[PDB]
Structure formats: C-alpha cells, structure tokens
Design a protein around this ligand. Structure first.
Ligand SMILES: [Mg+2]
Ligand SMILES: [Mg+2]
Ligand SMILES: [Mg+2]
Lengths: 141, 143, 143, 138
C-alpha cells in the first residue's frame, strides 16, 4: 500500500508500506536538464528516508531525456519504464539491479550501446528495445 | 589468424583443427546423428591420437538442422555467426561457463526457442536472437 | 486542423466530436464492455442528436485492454499510434475497407495476433506490428 | 541444359516453361544494380518468363538496388538476405507471394512499396531495422 507520494523536482515517488520507494513519474516540464540522475533515496514530510528500489512502469514514457543514471538502490526497472525516449543515448545501470522488465527501453532507437551489470538475473531480450543496438556488453563481477 | 592442420569427422560433427592447437566445429550433419539432441564434444582427437579443445562453434555449423536441444561444452569461447540459425525445433540450449562471445544472429529465427540462460563469462553479444519469435526472456547465470 | 466540439460516451466507448464533423474513438473502457469483442460503431450521436462518422481510432484508445477481437468499421480512415498496443488476447482484427493509414505501433506487442488482412484502401503503414512476434503473415486481397 | 547463365544470373528452367533465378554472382556483375531480366532463352531459342526469385538467390551480395520484373510471381525464402548495401527495391507488379525473410537484415532498406497484386507476405517490418514505413500501391 502507498504510504505517501513525494515530488522531488521532476520526480514523483510512491512510498510503500514495506519501506521502499518507486519512481512513478518523470515530468520533463519540471526538469532542469535532459540528463536524469535518479536519486537513490527519497525523504517524506516527516524526514524519514526511503531507498528508491523500483523505476515504475512507464515512469519515463515518451520523455526527452538524453541520458540516465539508474542508482545502485534500484532492484527492478519496470515495464516500458523508458519507452519511446527517442533522444535517450546514454544509460548507466548499476550493480544491484536484478530485473529489467518487458520493453523497459522500448523504441529507444537512439540507444546504440548498453552494458548489463553482473547482478542482473533476468531481462527482456535487450535487442527488442532499439533498432540501433547492434551489441550488448555484460559487466564481469 | 591461423591455418587448418586437419579435418576430423566424429559422428555427425565435422571439426577443423587449427595450427594454434584449437578446434572449430564447422558442420553438423543431421543424417549421421543418433538423436536430435546435440551433445557437442569438448575435445576432438586427430589421426595421431592428439587431443584438441573445441573452442569455437563455426559460422552456420547447425544452420537449418532438426536439433531439439544442444549442449555447448565448457571448452567453447565463441559461437559463430548464424551457428544455430533457422533451427525451428531447437528449444533447449545449454551454454557453459567460459563462453565469451555470441556472434551475430547465432540463434536467429529459432521459433521454438522461448528462453536462454547466459553464462556469467559472456562479455559481448551481437543480436543473436533476431527473428526468434518466442525468445522474450534472457536469464543470466551468477558467478 | 480542427478543435473538439464535444465528448460522448457510448457504453465502453469514449468519442471526441471535432468541428470538421468527424468523430474519433479516444478510449475503450473494459469495465463497461459487455464482451471482449469490440464491435466499434460506424457513427456516434452527440447530445443534440446529430450523427457523425467514426473516422479515427485515437492514439492508445484500446492500449492494454482484454479485447479478443475487433471490427474497425468502414467509416474509419486512420488508426492512431499504439491504438491496439499491448492487447495480449487480441487475435481477430477486421479492418476498415476505407482505412488509409495505420500509424506507428498501432498493433504493437500483441502476442496473440498471428495474422492480419490489410484492406486494399491502405496506402501507408508505420511499423504497426513491432514486438508482435507471432505476427508472421500479412494477407491482402490482391488482383 | 536445364541451367542458363545470363551474366551474373543463373536460372533453372522448368518443364512448365517458367524460369527461377537461382543465383546472383556478384564477381560476374557489371554493377551493383541488379536489373533482373523478365525472360531467359535456352540453347534452342525458347523463351522462359522469370517467375520466381529462388531461395537465397542474392544472399550476402553487394547489390545496392534491384528491379524485380513484372514476370515475377514469387520471391523465395531469404532471397535477398544479408544484402547490407541494398537500399532500393522495385517490385512490380504481378508479384503475388513474398516468402519468409525475403529481405532479412537488408538494414540499409529505408522504405518499400508493396504492389497491389501481392496476396500474402512475411511481415515486411522484420526485414530491416531502418524500415519505418511500408507503402501500398493502388
Ligand atoms: Mg519463422
Ligand atoms: Mg552476466
Ligand atoms: Mg510480450
């Protein structure tokens, strides 16, 4: 169950009963740049800190981002999280990511390269994401 | 970077042994196989009894064959271009730790292939699953 | 270039009426439907009783719905972006005989769609079937 | 006798009086433009319409453009597969069937026009990573 919704600049987060946060929406009209440096934590109205463990379903859908850092607090990237981000060319994934859900980078056709962290256990076939993604690299543990 | 020293036939498998001391699986001949499961040998012996590791699955080695399953042994470092392409009955692929490279379209248009597990040793993949309809999910082996 | 005159609800269907005298189907609400077959009306009546043709299936109108089949009536000229995307039970699509354009990803990631018949009137399609990997064959009436 | 060579083109001639283009040999071609002949003649001067582009006929060749003449009824499986420089395909007009992966990995192909005669084809969006739009001629 959602405990509260917190807005941090262009980011909307939902805080759950289990003490984790999901990044539910990126609002490009509120962003200071096209590089999304996603925070690893979010603080509620009472000063309690929660880790950002999930990039929610369609959170960045159809946004103008050119680059993104997914912090090491994130365990899962949701379905269509970065779908139709037509200018997205630089994706930094971090060691602790376990799951990359279906079509997480659907039609990110400016994405030419991606490196998968050693921690990833299950992902959607990454070659479905971008028409320009010829090769996928895997980080060694 | 090398030259073929000898060609060896082991049942349905053709191997080329290179002067660098490694062997490439160049062809799978269906008509000589005992079953549709390809249990690829990790090594091949030449006419003088010398043993060589099978380090590469050659380009198109299993192209359009009737295989239902395959074990790629721990001796293999790379899987060549279209090595298992258009294998419409292939549903079970065992990759082993030591594989580094999966070349372009290596498992292309394999319509019965629904999943694959990638070993922790794999460093690079050139779109090996293009046109393989049911290949949604990729699992990754931990170290 | 037009403006929305009014919005009309007809069972599970939401329509926008434009000043050019046409209607766009903007949303399909699963919870208001009597069945999983979407028999889209060819016309819609506004609050003053005026009938208008349904000429467009709007962007994402049926996105992620439970529909198993759809009839796109002969009044429809264009199917919008992602109009039927992610409809994983959709297997039967009857398209409009006046359909001219099928916009980008209109039938994307529809994993149960195995075939489609394209009407002779269609002039242009912007990759409508991306990620619908069971969609092998496309039929046309021909000569 | 049942095989005819016309420059870079090999044709197999059938009992039913039709011909299949079985192979394109780029080392024998005068250019990278494959203007496929609509007919082929045997040693006795009998003319055979070219009705089929055979399976893998142009596989991995250097062609930059192709005209498939109005005599062709079917394009075979992987006929133009891995033709990495192919950017212009003219289909004519009598074509009925386009078999599986006829233009597989023809990733320099940005648009294609499908003739009104085509009745059944492999999804053309599978062929090229650069093919955003398919046009249908009336
Ligand atoms: Mg197939
Ligand atoms: Mg790994
Ligand atoms: Mg799917």
């Amino acid at each position: 169950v959602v405990e509260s919704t917190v807005q941090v600049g262009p980011y909307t987060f939902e805080i759950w009963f289990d003490g984790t946060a999901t990044l539910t929406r990126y609002d490009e009209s509120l962003a200071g740049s096209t590089y999304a440096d996603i925070p690893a934590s979010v603080t509620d109205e009472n000063g309690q800190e929660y880790p950002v463990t999930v990039i929610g379903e369609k959170a960045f859908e159809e946004t103008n981002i050119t680059g993104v850092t997914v912090p090491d607090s994130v365990i899962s990237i949701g379905r269509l999280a970065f779908a139709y981000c037509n200018s997205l060319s630089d994706v930094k994934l971090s060691e602790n990511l376990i799951y990359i859900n279906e079509l997480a980078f659907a039609s990110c056709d400016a994405l030419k390269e991606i490196t998968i962290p050693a921690s990833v256990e299950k992902m959607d076939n990454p070659f479905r994401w971008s028409n320009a993604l010829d090769t996928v690299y895997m980080e060694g543990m």
